[PDB]
Amino acid sequence: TRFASVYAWNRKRISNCVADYSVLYNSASFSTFKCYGVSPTKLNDLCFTNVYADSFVIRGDEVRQIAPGQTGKIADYNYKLPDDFTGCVIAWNSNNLDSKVGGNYNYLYRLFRKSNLKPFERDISTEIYQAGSTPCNGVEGFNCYFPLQSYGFQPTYGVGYQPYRVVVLSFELLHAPATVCGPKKSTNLVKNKCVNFN
């Protein structure tokens, strides 16, 4: 029903289950499935230990910023994607659940930061950003700005200004007693014939 904000994204840890990378690739309601790493059809071949899921709610054509080695305002100080990305990014249209008539200002994004974010780091603390040598010493003043600004969402913004929920999946390729796997085979059975059994 609801997803975490782009400045403070959720972190879902998935392990100890059968991975099904078949319906995800087969659904037609996925505006973006391009991803870098292993083949999207070879996913049900490797076995991993941990799977990480990150959820974002961003605005339209901005979704191209999420890539291994792209700069901007979401991939620089809001969510830094590692250069050696080993997961996949899925984005679909969410104009029917994220847009409200009159504006939906409940999705805040950070706009001010003093340094570029390292891969997989969170800055949830909200403090007024100082630009120069003028501390506010109060509630609001000059050289005082709030990093968090709420997104505007209405059902009619065209194409490039519509909300587009994004899910990023990170697979770790460490050497360990991996458990996360997928359905291997369901081949039929024959009797009384010299065969190779596995």
Binding site: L111, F112, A131, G132, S133, T134, F142, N143, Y145, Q149, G152, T156, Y157, G158, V159, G160, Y161
Partner: protein
Amino acid sequence: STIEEQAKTFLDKFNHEAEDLFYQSSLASWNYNTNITEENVQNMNNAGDKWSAFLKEQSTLAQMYPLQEIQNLTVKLQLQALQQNGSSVLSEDKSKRLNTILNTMSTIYSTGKVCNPDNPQECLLLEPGLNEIMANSLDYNERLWAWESWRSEVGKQLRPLYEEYVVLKNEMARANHYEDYGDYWRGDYEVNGVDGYDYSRGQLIEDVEHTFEEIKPLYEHLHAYVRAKLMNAYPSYISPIGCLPAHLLGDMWGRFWTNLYSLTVPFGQKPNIDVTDAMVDQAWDAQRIFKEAEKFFVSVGLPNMTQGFWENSMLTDPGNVQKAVCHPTAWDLGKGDFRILMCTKVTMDDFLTAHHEMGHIQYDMAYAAQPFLLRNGANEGFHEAVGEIMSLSAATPKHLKSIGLLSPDFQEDNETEINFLLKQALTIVGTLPFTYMLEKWRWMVFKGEIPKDQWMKKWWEMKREIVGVVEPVPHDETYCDPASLFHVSNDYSFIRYYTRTLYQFQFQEALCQAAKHEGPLHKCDISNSTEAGQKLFNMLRLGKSEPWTLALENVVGAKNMNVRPLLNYFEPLFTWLKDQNKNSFVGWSTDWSPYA
């Protein structure tokens, strides 16, 4: 601390709110225009007041920035608009009076009431009413009477307010480091950027007179032709000694000569090109008008319409109580949203209007990626030219035959084209002498080189000199004729209609050169040519990010304001006009009048 870097934060925080605030403002305006009801009048007022209160907050802080050391030419230009002092430089008791006079002028200008003296209960208004009297009639004792009645009861009350308004506006302009109020209207035709592309406000005043003398023989020929045609119908009232009278142009002010086309037709045997019944016979609705005409924008390579325009914007059929304004408008609401407000019908004129409106929409979409402070053209004289390029190059017989609306057996002759060349000539170059008149008049009166008494005497002595309009009835200094104009009382500049003519034909000829078209210019089209879609696109997307002088290099050969195509487009017109005034004298003397 640092001053150059910190401004980036301010301009990145201001425009984020400006974009969406203007978005709700545009949406409220569209709702009010679509729904004529008291239930939608408070919201638009509230949105306008909120936006006005927000604009002042973000413009007051943009004076502490020393806009003489910032390196980049983009942020400096962006902050220059925020640095404008506006009208908040006067005293509050003075600003209140100036605003009251400005509102009173507009309110009174729409309260024209003149009753017929013999039937004192019958007044007529500037709207339908007195307008119809001079628009289509065949009489001489009534057209002058309507002119006199209109110009003798509206000026006597606008003059006292305008007298103080001019002085107060000049005083307000003085506070912005300008010599007069003319600099406040010439401020957009000025660039101080890249070397070799620089411009000055003092250059346009001498450049406006050096482009009008080269088209004066054409106006002399057209005036001689129309005077000769009027001598063939009207009785012995017009004289070859002087020139054409005042109340026979076809309008109250004489801006357009469209009402004289029927009276001044060379040959009446051949009718005009009409295809309205051609569309009606095939049962074309207004949606097919928008669908069959958008395809002309596709063959040239221009991008397609975004989804939502065909759903949000109303196309036609107001019908029932759901009344809407029928004024043709194109709205760029922001956030990627575009709409059209038009009561489209089955008309070739409506076809041209639809082309004009979606041309405005295309031009608005061209620079959609520019920042909010740069979501406009380099200058304001580009929108109309962009809208009218396709209006001009969309009525050619080849274009209509390609769609499949006329039979392929059409046999146009020379006279079929002479009337089409004359109909556009009577409209285009028929208003140019009235623009250089009013605009130069306002510029000189705002300069103040003339005293208070010598105000109206110069207007009539210069109107006869250039345009050639004699006084039909004598008027004294207390009369105020030009105050009975739309762009004289609402503080509207009257220079946007003069460079538009040059821009239209410059762009048309420039696009026709690299389009494989040989021969005349009136039968040139850019349809089915992607080569005409690449040269134009390099300038449409620039918006206000680049100066207009620089922008006039990638589409046209030269940047200078030289009126070449007008002496080339109407070449058959001149060739036919130089053979008709063989024995008739061409010119006028500023001494003959109907009354003396």
